[PDB]
Design an enzyme around this catalytic site. Structure first.
Site, short mmCIF file in Angstrom:
data_model
loop_
_atom_site.label_atom_id
_atom_site.label_comp_id
_atom_site.label_asym_id
_atom_site.label_seq_id
_atom_site.Cartn_x
_atom_site.Cartn_y
_atom_site.Cartn_z
N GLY A 1 -6.24 1.84 12.68
CA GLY A 1 -5.03 1.04 12.68
C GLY A 1 -4.08 1.62 13.71
O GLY A 1 -4.51 2.35 14.61
N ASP B 1 3.94 -5.74 2.92
CA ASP B 1 2.78 -6.28 3.61
C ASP B 1 1.53 -6.11 2.75
O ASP B 1 0.72 -5.21 2.98
CB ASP B 1 2.62 -5.52 4.93
#
Ligand SMILES: Nc1ncnc2c1ncn2[C@@H]1O[C@H](COP(=O)(O)OP(=O)(O)NP(=O)(O)O)[C@@H](O)[C@H]1O
Lengths: 355, 123
Positions: free
Chosen positions: A19, A137
């Site tokens: 990520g 999120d």
């Protein structure tokens, strides 16, 4: 910049996960043989926002202990020397897969899998929400999964608490970022009302995703997202349309023909009666009409798994002051270093066990 | 100084000797509990009153009522010069999976952030 020197407590086995703000790898604790995930966050103090986000992530995960929330098993102490300490290593439960990988596969996902996955997700959230923490999120890839269908919430860098006194709304949206697909109307429309309900829009999207095995609102850009939603939900009532804070998206809301909702029974024709009833209670424009995670745990759809005694609140609420919005980068490094030390310093073999 | 005794099933007991102090927080217990009970998550613990009735602590607040009772209990004991008993707590057993009355999932081949996908694997 992914190079792991964890040395001698742990042995690195491959790399699983990637990520921004870090790279994750499988690892085995040397002497015990216990399998773990290790997440390296290279140069984690170099950027003030990444710095806050890191400190934010450590404090949040330290606060929680819950089977549905990912846990820090260890945080490696600074190796020799301080020497302008750069990369932070955090050890976590090793999770084999994630819900996104599960939802999209040729593997069967039964109604019973959606029930149990949805239950565990709602469980961890009830917990996190009572700490007064909004994840912000939540998407199938942030929900880790293993062969036995344990589900654990990850990725707390986007989490913020509060909202504070009337400020900061507005600046509530900084820095952040998130895919619009799971994003809640109040975050889309600047509705000046931001609560734990934010996460529950995301759950509805995930819930719908699991039933159809395809993304519910995969908008290609802002108004398309706004439109895809309005297709099934109809247009927002005047009260919310007048509650819009910017652009004005209120204009183009004021435009367009008022539409009507599409019953979830047509959008998911072949779908369980109960599942749809709960899905409906989660997806609503006004955050205040959205069922809570706590109440959703009591919906008949989840009745099979519901255990009032097994669904804890989080005892002291998380304290989000320490908000770093300016708060110079060095003092942040100090605090991140202030954790990891405290983490180790809280043991304290302070006890004796009777033979 | 205060000693808390943690009853651990089929094992024995753990005696936690506190600092002092102040102040004892509910988390300080949960943290010691999870430390002596590593393979579990414990959100709660009970303790007995004069009657021998379990009373559960889920937070601070109720923490304060435990300390209040046990301090009374302590006062009376060595006023009579009796041997002082540690404060005994019983961690509430929480279910593992457990919750999953049935089933599994494959992790060998993921690929795969699909949409209608996903085009990849291996084995
Ligand atoms: N404990 C874990 N066990 C197994 N896989 C994990 C674990 N943690 C993270 N991963 C995988 O590694 C990826 C990266 O970790 P993650 O914490 O999400 O990074 P990050 O700081 O969140 N970056 P981002 O996803 O862009 O916000 C995750 O998406 C997972 O898929």
């Amino acid at each position: 910049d992914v190079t792991f020197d964890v040395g001698d407590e742990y042995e690195i086995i491959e790399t699983i996960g990637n990520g921004a703000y870090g790279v994750v790898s499988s690892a085995r604790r040397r002497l015990t043989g216990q399998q773990v995930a290790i997440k390296k966050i290279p140069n984690a103090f170099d950027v003030v926002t990444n710095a806050k986000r890191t400190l934010r992530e450590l404090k949040i995960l330290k606060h929680f202990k819950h089977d549905n929330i990912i846990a820090i098993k260890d945080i490696l102490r600074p190796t020799v020397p301080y020497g302008e300490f750069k990369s932070v290593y955090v050890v976590l439960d090793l999770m084999e897969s994630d819900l996104h990988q599960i939802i999209h596969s040729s593997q069967p996902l039964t109604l019973e899998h959606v029930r149990y996955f949805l239950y565990q997700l709602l469980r961890g959230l009830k917990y996190m929400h009572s700490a007064q923490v909004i994840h912000r999120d939540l998407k199938p890839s942030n929900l880790l999964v293993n062969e036995n269908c344990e589900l654990k919430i990850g990725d707390f860098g986007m989490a913020r608490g509060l909202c504070t006194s009337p400020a900061e709304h507005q600046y509530f949206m900084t820095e952040y970022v998130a895919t619009r697909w799971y994003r809640a109307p109040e975050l889309m429309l600047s509705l000046h009302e931001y609560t734990q309900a934010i996460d529950l829009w995301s759950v509805g999207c995930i819930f719908g995703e699991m039933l159809a095995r395809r993304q519910l609102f995969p908008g290609k850009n802002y108004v398309h997202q706004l439109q895809l939603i309005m297709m099934v939900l109809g247009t927002p009532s005047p009260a919310v349309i007048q509650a819009v804070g910017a652009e004005r998206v209120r204009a183009y809301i004021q435009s367009l023909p008022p539409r009507q909702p599409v019953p979830w029974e047509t959008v998911y024709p072949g779908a369980d009666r109960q599942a749809l009833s709960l899905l409906g209670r989660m997806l609503r424009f006004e955050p205040s009409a959205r069922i809570s995670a706590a109440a959703a745990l009591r919906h008949p759809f989840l009745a099979k798994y519901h255990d009032p005694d097994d669904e804890p609140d989080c005892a002291p609420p998380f304290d989000f002051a320490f908000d770093r919005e300016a708060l110079t980068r060095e003092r942040i490094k100090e605090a991140i270093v202030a954790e990891i030390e405290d983490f180790h310093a809280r043991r304290e073999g302070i006890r004796q066990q009777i033979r | 100084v205060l000693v808390i005794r943690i009853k651990i099933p089929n094992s024995g007991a753990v005696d936690w000797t506190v600092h002092s102090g102040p102040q004892l927080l509910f988390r300080d217990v949960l943290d010691v509990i999870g430390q002596v009970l590593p393979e579990a998550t414990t959100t709660a613990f009970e303790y007995e009153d004069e009657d021998g009735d379990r009373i559960t602590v889920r937070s601070d607040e109720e923490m304060k009522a435990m300390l209040s009772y046990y301090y009374s209990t302590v006062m009376e004991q060595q006023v009579n010069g009796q041997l002082i008993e540690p404060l005994q707590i019983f961690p509430r057993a929480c279910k593992p999976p457990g919750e999953r009355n049935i089933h599994g999932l494959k992790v060998n081949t993921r690929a795969g952030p699909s949409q209608s996908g996903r085009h990849h694997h291996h084995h």
